[PDB]
Amino acid sequence: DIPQPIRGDKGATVKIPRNIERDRQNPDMLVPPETDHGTVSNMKFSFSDTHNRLEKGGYAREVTVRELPISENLASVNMRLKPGAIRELHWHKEAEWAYMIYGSARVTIVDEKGRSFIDDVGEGDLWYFPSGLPHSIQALEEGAEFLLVFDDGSFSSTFQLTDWLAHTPKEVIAANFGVTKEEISNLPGKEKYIFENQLPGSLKDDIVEGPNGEVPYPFTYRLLEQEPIESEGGKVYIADSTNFKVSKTIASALVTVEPGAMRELHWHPNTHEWQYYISGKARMTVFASDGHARTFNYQAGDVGYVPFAMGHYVENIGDEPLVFLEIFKDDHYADVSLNQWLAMLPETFVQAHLDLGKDFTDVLSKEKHPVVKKK
Amino acid sequence: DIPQPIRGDKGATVKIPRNIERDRQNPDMLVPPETDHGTVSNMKFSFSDTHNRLEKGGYAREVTVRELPISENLASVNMRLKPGAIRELHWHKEAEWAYMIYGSARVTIVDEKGRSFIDDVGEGDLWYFPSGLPHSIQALEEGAEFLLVFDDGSFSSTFQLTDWLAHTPKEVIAANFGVTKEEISNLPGKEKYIFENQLPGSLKDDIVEGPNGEVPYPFTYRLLEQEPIESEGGKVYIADSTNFKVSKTIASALVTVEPGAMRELHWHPNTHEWQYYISGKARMTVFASDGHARTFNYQAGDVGYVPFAMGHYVENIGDEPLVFLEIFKDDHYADVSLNQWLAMLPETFVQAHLDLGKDFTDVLSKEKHPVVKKK
Amino acid sequence: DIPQPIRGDKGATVKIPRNIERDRQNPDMLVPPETDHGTVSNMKFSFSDTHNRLEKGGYAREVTVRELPISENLASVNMRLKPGAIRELHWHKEAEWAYMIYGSARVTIVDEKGRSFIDDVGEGDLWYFPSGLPHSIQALEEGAEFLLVFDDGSFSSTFQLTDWLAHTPKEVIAANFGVTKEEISNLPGKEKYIFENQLPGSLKDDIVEGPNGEVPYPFTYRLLEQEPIESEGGKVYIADSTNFKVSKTIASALVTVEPGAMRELHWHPNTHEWQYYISGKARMTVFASDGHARTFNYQAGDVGYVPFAMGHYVENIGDEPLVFLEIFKDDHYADVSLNQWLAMLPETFVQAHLDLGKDFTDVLSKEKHPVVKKK
Amino acid sequence: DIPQPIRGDKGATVKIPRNIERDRQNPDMLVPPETDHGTVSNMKFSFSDTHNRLEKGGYAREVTVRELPISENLASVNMRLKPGAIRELHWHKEAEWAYMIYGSARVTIVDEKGRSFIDDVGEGDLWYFPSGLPHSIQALEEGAEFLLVFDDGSFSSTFQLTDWLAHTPKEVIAANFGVTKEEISNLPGKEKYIFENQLPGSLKDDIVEGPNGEVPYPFTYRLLEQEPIESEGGKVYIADSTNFKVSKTIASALVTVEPGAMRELHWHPNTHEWQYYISGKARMTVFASDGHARTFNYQAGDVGYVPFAMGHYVENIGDEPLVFLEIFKDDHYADVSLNQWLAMLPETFVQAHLDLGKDFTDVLSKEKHPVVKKK
Amino acid sequence: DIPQPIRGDKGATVKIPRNIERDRQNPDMLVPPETDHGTVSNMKFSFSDTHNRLEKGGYAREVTVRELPISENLASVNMRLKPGAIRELHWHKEAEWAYMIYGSARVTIVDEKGRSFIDDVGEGDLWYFPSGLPHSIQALEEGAEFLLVFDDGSFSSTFQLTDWLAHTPKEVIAANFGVTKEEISNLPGKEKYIFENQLPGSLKDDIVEGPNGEVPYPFTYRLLEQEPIESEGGKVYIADSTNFKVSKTIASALVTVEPGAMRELHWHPNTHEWQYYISGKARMTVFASDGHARTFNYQAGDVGYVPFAMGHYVENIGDEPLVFLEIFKDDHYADVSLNQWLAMLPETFVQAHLDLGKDFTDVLSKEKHPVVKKK
Ligand SMILES: [Cl-]
Ligand SMILES: [Cl-]
Ligand SMILES: [Cl-]
Ligand SMILES: [Cl-]
Ligand SMILES: [Cl-]
Ligand SMILES: [Mn+2]
Ligand SMILES: [Mn+2]
Ligand SMILES: [Mn+2]
Ligand SMILES: [Mn+2]
Ligand SMILES: [Mn+2]
Ligand SMILES: [Mn+2]
Ligand SMILES: [Mn+2]
Ligand SMILES: [Mn+2]
Ligand SMILES: [Mn+2]
Ligand SMILES: [Mn+2]
């Protein structure tokens, strides 16, 4: 049907030409809760509203501070590789965190002591590459599609192996390696970035031994192999520097919310939250203090954000599971639950605040249930 | 059908959950021209992706620098009023320009010499209110829906008459007017902002005479009553400070592009362009120098932007007329046409640049045709 | 009498209308030391020159970067609560440090693991609440008046429990707790902030047990129960992260200077100093390098500041004890004493600098005496 | 010989490896005047210390805010073209001012009304291109070497005709001009920037007539054909918006100072001065207030700067004429002469300031002599 | 001879007056590698292009962000002291690192616990003074010349002992020490900064004992007494916080490159590199990503810079050893070698990137050789 911005005796029909498909995606923005108030920055952006860079072997598109200006500290790329296709050997200033949504890939990294790590990553697995350490990605037989998160919102360029070489004098490259200019005459004249290639062999045949030893901590993590926090309406899997040891600047949670359930009312006492919606449909109200609150809708492909310590919840508003990531630029994950907070205070003190009685304080739980199901 | 980000042997199918409706709206973003290159800021945002403020009497939603960070100098509100409904008497730091898309409204303004101007505005008419001059809007019998543009991208609050009074000591208000506190006890305790009211009478019965004379220049302009620049594929109506005399800080063009036509390749030598798409479907490539270019799609409800002097065109990609506004924070409208530029140079000099011959330079026109039709 | 800005043959009588009471408070500003020189930022502001927010149950007033722009990293609130009155359950981005000047209060805090801490605080006691951890204050039978310091100078709003709830959809609150909308219909429609309430019972009856254990470190500290550094002219009590373990971002000293005594010539090698004058009258010269120095006067109710590493002293210029706080945004307190510095160098090297002899270097002490008494 | 940083009993021999050739170029920096004092920003940079971009047809090198950070508002390019060589048709945000040091060139410009201007420029002639108006340069039979000044210090890229076309979809270019894609298949795939070409014919055969009329004001100026201000030690030729009418944002003076002469003590009351040293050797002291002053040396190829209203002089310290440009981002040239200032005051008032008598005030001149010769 | 900016069929002779001596110093800037491309900030500045502050006892000159704006985090002073001459007792906000290029000096430092450290430093030795800790330098019988590096690029003033005292009221100084105003009447009226003095006695006779114990870590380091990393073409000596324990904010390497050798292709994965060229002649290309690269020349007296993670090499282009320092604002030194990186990957994966075969991958070394010699 044709939604209208009308809530009781407020609002009016739209009389100008309009985008009905977007209005249908944003029911809580066309018709917000009457409890929303005040100016709040935009906290929502879709990867579908970005330019897609197409290459022989896949694609990449990005959501940065140039698209979502509230997110100054975190930026993201949605990258797709065809079977065997390679994301060229490269490095950058930013640390990189990744979640494998579809397929599988082989990654390489070499550290500043010349120690190498090569591993395969499947659906639900993570990687984290510390700032400036060079790495590559190669999709295996299914291809691969993954979300990358960088710990600077201004992320724009990366340093590519073949770009460096194409911009270094040939006589210097030749001197660097002890070869003649003729022996390196076939070097590419420009970057590859993403390129097609044959499927690699078995992981065990790729492992490179060297004089400098094994890396002290792995750069990949099997998130979905861990035991989640399970509550009535869903599951939360947390990876931060306490369990995924190398992941110093990114803390993460994968949240699944069943139909009829919600990520409970909470905030993060440490830093801003950046969100990616893998599947399903949500709404979230962000409470910004001083009587300011604004509700946003999200679905698969959307990036969201919750500035440091703002109150929020994430409600599944669809008939399928809602699956999303909560990402923090910090060495740990932390939340304060509204329910648990109030449960741990004297009941008459809580009653004095809320103008409610024992029938309310009796429902509070001292145990944290990150995802709750509607009764 | 199901679009895919594939262009020849580049790109791949989407393997993750996705937003198919948005992908269908953005065909030149999911599959950009092969001529696009490099990092370019986002130049596109939809009013449908904003929170709608609903009141008794209408609604308002906004696109500001908090949504579209490239647009630091210009922000916009889409406001709707029901019949008789009033946008409360108010003022702000920003100058305000307006285009009436639907219906009609009565406006009031009083200047710094105490001179008043009251007028009715219909579809295709403009207003402009200089910074800090207080004004109101009241929809007539059809109601009204209009686009407001403010000459600061950070636009967020306005000063409302009843809010000022509600935050002034009652004894001061009473002293200001020579009345008792009892005589003003019924003042509202909070702002109205938008409120329902009876239809006003005839314009002529509202005109207020005073000791200070007539305003020197009218604050409204009948844009669509002017003679447009007519070219093969469409029409352009320009209002800037040379014709709409009070409009010192906003220059504007309403452009109509027939199906199969395009706003020609051009740039603006004076300042940034802010766009609103009233109806139809477009694509535009923004050329940013140094080999950077990015293509965007637009449709009804979208805001666009073209930073100062960047090369661009606007192509109708639908079967209905494309109608949009070009807005500039300047005292005049100016463009340089690629066609006219090259037509006014020696033909062999142009040939030396383009590696093309007389058969090309023969097609160039010394006359500017802002909108061209495909052959 | 009537002070005049005259120092020997410099200065002149004031010939315009003037503020004689303020001139009397600022004798070293109306008539500075002849050793002052150059442009130095303002380092002084009075709480009496701020707006006082009055509520049922007390008041609060603040000195922020909007009042004292040199203090970009630290801001402060002077808050007063009547007996039993409650500062509403709330949180904020900033860490909070506090000094109880008058009376006593009960505080609550619940951490990110759901562990609670409830304690009573009396005169001379501190609290510290880490960023984002929710807390409350309730005055006991004497009421309470305390100084709060926040580790951001831009401090302006806090997140209040009842404000969050008033801006969350009722259906979401009901879903969050497993109750009906009817059971929460009496929730307040706006924040309380400060509110009157009955005196609480004994502390031991308020302690809440829970499944998550005791907090690892207490959030309160009995500063005046510690052994001070005692020197001839006064006492210094230091609390930083080395003794008050949770106090990671605020280091503090309470200094008492007897009449005729002075906080010695020193600087802080770690960070800026923020000052609050609890009682008495002072002057301080701030030495800013490159021959710049400016003298300021302070008395009860004043905030002062000393930018990172600037040389200074604090002289009691009255007949009662001078009592003030030195606050640092750091994990430790550190000072370098001019006396001790020179005492620890070879005497002829010091003599070569100062153009003075053994009779001077003989007075230097290798032991640090933070507060010295005039002979 | 080997200069040393020694001035009387101050300074010492250099004991580390050093750059003797640069020390010889900077005698007043290795051994400054004893009257210099305090921290002053760098006001000097050489084009020889910049990367030279070499192309088929010439070269270009630049001094921007990235080289000389004091100069935030003005940047410069030294460009050289071989005979017939073309600086490709282009535009940019910045206004452009130029001085032809060597040879001659033909310029084209087309304005926003489609009016064209084509002219030849020889040694000592200027051009000025308003922001965003497209233009080209083509060297004639001698080739050409010129200094360009842009009215933004951040100047980095320009919009090139063939770059725009190479980044526009071929179907759009074809639609724009009413030609087929096949007819434009030979368009260059990348920019030309600077390219070789045959010498053009006579100027009169290039003039393009059109329907839109003559430009109202010429874009070139014959500076050295004007009557200079002639004083005892040299000559000054001024071009600003009062005589070179289009030159709205750049005011300029070409100064020649004979051996033994100096540009007198003066300042500019309007804005910052940017300098280019065409030939000879200079020193200048910049007086920055508050007892700060620093002396710099300049020679051919150097850029200098004098921030707004700072006191200065320019002394010829060589045996050939010193020739330099003074450039201002303003609509006029203005200076205050120290001599003329004091000459226009009562002599006893001047004597009271300087502690000198009639024998000094008797030498002052009420007439301004910008360049004075040593007696 | 007379160099010209000509590379094959690109470039042209210089036709304007020019700086031939600087052009001869910058052969790779007048004629860059054809592989250079795009806008890159200036990464080079000479101490010879700075004002030299001359005093009785020596000199000091500086390169700060005001000279080299890319270097926002690090600034440097070249200071020279005559025999016995003293750099006055002082402190500052910035941490200070030093390298003794010529001669020897005695340093003093007293920490925040009143512990003193006095030591002699010779050629090749370092010091590091933590922020705000007061210190002095006194040259011994050879005099001294050293490079100081400060961990803020805005470095401008320091706090001097005698300046502090000259700007403190005499009555306060007298009260601080328990002396009369008459006993301190001979204090200097202004700073000394650098001053002549008799040679000190033996180090052992200067050591000051005190009640507070020995400093836990020494403030000097004998860099050239350590075992260097020795490779075919040179030597690298590293001092960071892992070996020079107090040096928390500065990591450093002294690199020696024999004629015909080069510091290999590498980057730093942690932070920006600041360079000082002690002796010899170099070129370096900085690779900035996205196809941007620019080559710079350096010789004795030059400061260089390499922004975080940019690719680079340093080639000796002279007939003597090239000796330079690499400085980082970090707690450790780290590099990634291009050679070692590729050696630690599967050979066919490397071949797939570079379009080269086994004859290339066979030359790669798993061991890092920071300095390589040409074959
Ligand atoms: Cl990437
Ligand atoms: Cl409005
Ligand atoms: Cl508060
Ligand atoms: Cl150019
Ligand atoms: Cl120094
Ligand atoms: Mn990466
Ligand atoms: Mn969350
Ligand atoms: Mn308005
Ligand atoms: Mn346009
Ligand atoms: Mn608080
Ligand atoms: Mn202090
Ligand atoms: Mn140009
Ligand atoms: Mn001048
Ligand atoms: Mn120092
Ligand atoms: Mn390096």
Q: Give a three-class secondary structure readout of chain C.
A: CCCCCEECCEECCCCCCCCHHHHHHCHHHHCCCCCCECCCCCCEEEHHHCCCEEECCEEEEEECCCCCCCCCCCEEEEEEECCCCEEEEEECCCCEEEEEEEEEEEEEEECCCCCEEEEEEECCEEEEECCCCCEEEEEEEEEEEEEEEECCCCCCCCEEHHHHHHCCCHHHHHHHHCCCCHHHCCCCCCCCCEECCCCCCCHHHHCCCCCCCCCCCCCEEEHHHCCCEEECCEEEEEECCCCCCCCCCCEEEEEEECCCEEEEEEECCCCCEEEEEEECEEEEEEEEECCEEEEEEEECCEEEEECCCCEEEEEECCCCCEEEEEEECCCCCCCEEHHHHHHCCCHHHHHHHHCCCHHHHCCCCCCCCCEEECC
Residue ending a domain, among B222, B238, B260, is B222
SS3 of residue B350 by DSSP: helix
Task: Give the residue among C286, C276, C356 at the shortest CA–CA distance from C28.
Answer: C286
* Nearest CB neighbour to D186, from listed B287, B310, B355: B355
D367: CB partners within 8 A, 6+ apart: D340
- Experiment type: X-ray
Residues after which chain B is discontinuous, using a C–N cutoff of 2.5 Å: none
Q: Are residues D208 and D94 in the same domain?
A: yes
Q: How far is CA B59 from CA B155, C61, C223, in A?
A: 17, 38, 57
Do B129 and B228 fall within a single domain? no
Q: What are the DSSP calls for B201-253, one per residue?
A: --HHHH----TT---SS-SEEEGGGSPPEEETTEEEEEESTTTSTT--S-EEE
Element (H, E) at B164: helix B161-166
Is there a single domain that holds both residue D172 and residue D152?
Answer: yes
- Scan for tokens 């790729």, then name that residue: A206
- Distance between A374 CA and the closest CA of chain B, angstroms: 26
Distance, CA of B17 to CA of B19 (rounded, Å): 7
Residue C19: which residues within 8 A CB-CB, separation 6 or more? none
Residue C139 near residue C103 (C-beta atoms within 8 A)? yes
Please, where are the H alpha helices in chain D?
20-25, 27-30, 161-166, 170-177, 203-206, 338-343, 347-354, 358-361
Q: Are residues E289 and E174 in the same domain?
A: no
Residues of chain C with C-beta less than 8 angstroms from the C-beta of E212: 366
Residues from chain E that touch D32, judged by Cβ atoms under 8 A, are 51-54
β A322-328/A292-299 pair status: unpaired
- State whether residue E88 is helix, strand or coil: strand
Indicate the SS3 state at residue D152. Answer: coil
Q: Are residues D45 and D58 in the same domain?
A: no
Residue type, B225: E
Residue pair E234/E261 in contact (Cβ under 8 Å)? The answer is yes
The C-alpha of B175 sits at a distance from chain D's nearest C-alpha, in angstroms, of 47
Q: What are E350's two structure tokens?
A: 């490397």
Burial D198-229 (b: 16+ CB within 10 A, else e): eebeeeeebebebebeebeebbbbebeeeebb
Pick from A302, A296, A289: nearest CA to A314: A296
Q: Select from A249, A302, A244, A280 the least CA-distant residue to A126.
A: A244
Nearest-angstrom CA–CA distance, E22 and E17: 13
Which tokens belong to A26? 């944003």
Contact residues for C46 (Cβ-Cβ < 8 A; gap 6+): C301, C302, C303
- What domain range is A107 assigned to? 51-222
Nearest CA in chain E to A135: E341
Instruction: Please give the single-letter amino acid code of residue D349.
Output: F
The token pair at B137 is 């809007």
Mutate to test the interface with A, among B48, B104, B140 (most CBs of A within 10 A): B48
Contact assessment for residue E343 and residue E365, using Cβ atoms and an 8 Å cutoff: yes
- CB-based contact B353:D192 (threshold 8 Å): yes
Per DSSP, C89 falls in state E
Q: Which is it for strands A302-306 and A336-337: parallel, antiparallel or unpaired?
A: unpaired
C168 closest CA partner among B162, E229, A37: A37
Same domain for A367 and A299?
A: yes
Identify the helix (H) or strand (E) that includes residue E145.
strand E135-150
Residues 6+ apart with CB under 8 A from C195: C55, C56, C57, C85, C86, C88
Q: Which of A310, A349, A375 sits opposite C178 (nearest CB)?
A: A375
Contact in structure between E372 and E342 (CB atoms under 8 Å): no
Q: Closest Cα partner for C106 from C78, C143, C158?
A: C143
CB D87 within 8 A of CB D111: no
Resolution, Å (one decimal): 2.0
Q: Using a CB cutoff of 8 Å and minimum separation of 24, what contacts does E280-283 make?
A: E280/E316, E280/E318, E280/E320, E280/E321, E280/E322, E280/E323, E280/E324, E281/E316, E281/E317, E281/E318, E281/E320, E281/E322, E282/E257, E282/E314, E282/E315, E282/E316, E282/E317, E282/E318, E282/E322, E282/E324, E283/E28, E283/E314, E283/E315, E283/E317
Q: How close, in Å, is residue A175 to chain E by CA atoms? A: 5
Residue of A nearest to E287 (CA): A164
Q: Which of A135, A79, A130 is nearest to A106 (CA)?
A: A135
The residues, any chain, with a CB within 8 Å of residue D326's CB and separated by 6 or more, are D252, D253, D255, D273, D274, D275, D333
b/e map B71-84, b = 16+ CB within 10 Å: bebbbbbbbbbbbb
User: Would you put residue A30 in left (φ > 0), alpha (ψ -120 to 50) or beta?
Assistant: alpha
The residue from B190, B222, B254 where one domain ends is: B222
Q: Are E92 and E130 in contact (CB under 8 A)?
A: no
Is C359's CB within 8 Å of E88's CB?
no
* Cα(D27) to centroid(ligand 13), Å: 22
State whether E61 and E181 are in the same domain.
Answer: yes
Q: What is the DSSP string of D22-69?
A: HHHH-HHHHS--TT-BS-----EEEGGGS--EEETTEEEEEE-TTT-T
CB E196 within 8 A of CB E81: no
* Residues C296 and C28: beta-carbon distance below 8 Å: yes
- For chains C and B, tell me whether 3 or more CB atom pairs sit within 8 A of each other: no
Q: What are phi and psi of B341, to 5 degrees?
A: -55, -55
Residue whose token pair is 């040293």? D277
> Which other chains touch chain A, taking contact as 3+ CB pairs less than 8 Å apart?
B, C, E
- The answer to whether A194 touches A164, Cβ cutoff 8 Å, is no
- State residue D238 phi and psi, 5-degree precision: -110, 130
Whether D134 and D253 share a structural domain: no
Pairing verdict, β C261-267 and C336-337: antiparallel
Q: Which residues are within 8 A (CB) of E230 and not within 5 positions of it... i.e. 6 or more apart?
A: none
Q: Chain A residue closest to C195 (CA)? A: A353
CATH of the domain at A206: 2.60.120.10
CA distance D272 to D292: 17
Number of domains in chain E: 2
Q: Is C215 exposed, middle or buried (0-12, 13-18, 19+ CB in 10 A)?
A: middle
Closest-CA residue to B270 (of D216, D114, D113, D112): D112
Q: Which chains does chain E touch, 3 or more C-beta pairs < 8 A? A: A, C, D
Same domain, A166 and A244: no
* The pair of three-digit structure tokens given for residue E89, joined into one six-digit string: 């007792």
Q: Which residues, including other chains, have CB under 8 Å from residue D280's CB and lie 6 or more apart?
A: D257, D299, D300, D316, D318, D320, D321, D322, D323, D324
Nearest to B118 by CA among B194, B243, B205, B198: B205
Rounded-to-integer distance, Cα C232 and Cα B5, Å: 80
d(C-alpha B58, C-alpha B79), whole Å: 8
Contact B346 D116 (CB under 8 A): no
CA distance to B340, C94, D233, E186, per residue, from E177 (Å): 84, 41, 61, 15
What does the angle CA E283 – CA E287 – CA E293 come to, to the nearest 5 degrees? 80
Contacts of E359 (CB under 8 A, 6+ apart): A183
Q: Do A259 and A347 share a structural domain?
A: yes
- How far from the centroid of its chain's Cα atoms is residue E7's Cα? 34
Cβ atoms B94, B206 nearer than 8 A: no
HEC profile of D324-356 = EEEEECCCCCCCEEHHHHHHCCCHHHHHHHHCC
DSSP E37: B
- Chain B closest-CA separation from residue D162 CA (Å): 7
Using alpha carbons only, give the angle C72, A93, A328 rounded to the nearest 5 degrees. 60
User: In sequence order, what are the beta bridge partners of D78?
Assistant: D61, D147
Handedness of CA D305, D309, D311, D317 (dihedral sign): positive
Pairwise CA distance, residues D249 & D95, whole Å:
7
Q: Do E58 and D11 touch (CB under 8 A)?
A: yes
Phi–psi pair at B171, nearest 5 degrees: -65, -30
Q: Is B358 exposed, middle or buried (0-12, 13-18, 19+ CB in 10 A)?
A: exposed
Please pick, among D55, D258, D315, D326, the residue that the annotation labels catalytic. Answer: D326
- Within 13 Å and on the Cβ side, how many CA atoms surround A94? 22
Contact between B354 and D165 using a beta-carbon 8 Å cutoff: yes
Residues in chain A whose C lies over 2.5 Å from the next residue's N (breaks after): none
d(CA B57, CA B100): 17
Distance of CA B164 to the CA centre of its chain: 29
Residue finishing a domain among C222, C247, C275? C222
Contact E66 D67 (CB under 8 A): no
Cβ–Cβ pairs < 8 A, chains C and E: 155
Q: Would you state the structure tokens that stand for residue A321, as one six-digit string? A: 């599971």
- Tell me the backbone φ, ψ of residue C132, rounded to 5 degrees: 75, 0
> Residue B7 forms beta bridges with which residues?
B10
Query: Is D123 exposed, middle or buried (CB count within 10 Å of its CB: 0-12, 13-18, 19+)?
Result: middle
Centroid of ligand 6 to alpha carbon of E248 (angstroms): 29
Which amino acid, one-letter code, is at E219?
F
CB B295 within 8 A of CB A51: yes
Amino acid at A187: L
Whose structure tokens read 């600098």? C353
Inter-CA distances, A214 with A209, B299, C30, D264, Å: 9, 55, 70, 72
CA angle centred on A158, ends A153 and A159, rounded to 5°: 150
For residues D75 and D59, what is the distance between their CA atoms, to the nearest angstrom? 17
- Per the document, the length of chain E is 375
Instruction: Say if CB E114 and CB C366 are below 8 A apart.
Output: yes
DSSP string, A313-337: EEEE-SSS-EEEEEEESSSS---EE
In contact, D275 and D298? CB cutoff 8 Å:
yes
Q: Taking the C-alpha atoms of B205, B208, B213 and B214 in order, what is their torsion angle to the nearest 10 degrees?
A: -50
| B204 and B299 co-located in one domain | no
A110, A130, A158 member nearest E344 (Cβ): A110
In DSSP terms, which residues pair with C168 in a beta bridge?
none
Pick from D335, D330, D358: nearest CA to D264: D335
Q: Which residue has the tokens 């003590």?
A: D265
User: What CA–CA distance (Å, rounded) separates A250 from A246?
Assistant: 9
Name beta bridge partners: A44: A304
Q: Return the structure tokens found at A83.
A: 């079977």
User: Is there a single domain that holds both residue D250 and residue D218?
Assistant: no
Tell me the HSE value of A41 on the side-chain side, using a 13 A CA sphere.
20
C-alpha to C-alpha distance for B332 and D107, rounded to whole angstroms: 27
CA A284 vs CA A291, A372, D101: distances in Å: 16, 15, 65
Q: What is the DSSP letter of B200?
A: P
Contact D90, D195 (CB under 8 A): no
Torsion of CA B4, B9, B15, B21, to 10 degrees: -10
Start-to-end Cα distance in chain B: 29
Measured distance CA(C137)–CA(C80) in Å, rounded:
11
**Which residue of E40, E52, E299 to mutate against D (max D Cβ within 10 Å)?**
E52
E191 carries an active-site annotation: no
